[PDB]
Amino acid sequence: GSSGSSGMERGVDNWKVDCKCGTKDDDGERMLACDGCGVWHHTRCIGINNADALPSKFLCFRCIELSGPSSG
Ligand SMILES: [Zn+2]
Ligand SMILES: [Zn+2]
């Protein structure tokens, strides 16, 4: 998967707004929180337009592996 170069708990309020583009706050394009973790993403980047409705649940790439019996 992708890798990280930097990051820290400081900047955007609770609502986690992150995307490949590089947005940290509501720019203007509709977004949706990942039912899995709870991160707002660009409904467009993910591949969705206002035209169609929103998916009951949307999981991110990080969740794909996050989801598990892993107690720790
Ligand atoms: Zn984006
Ligand atoms: Zn997620």
Curated annotation (Swiss-Prot):
Task: Please state what the protein is called.
Answer: PHD finger protein At1g33420
Annotated compartments:
Nucleus
Q: Which residues of the full protein are shown?
A: 595 to 653 of 697
Which segments does the entry list as coiled coil? none
Residues in PHD-type zinc fingers run: 16-66
Q: Which species is this UniProt entry from? A: Arabidopsis thaliana (Mouse-ear cress)
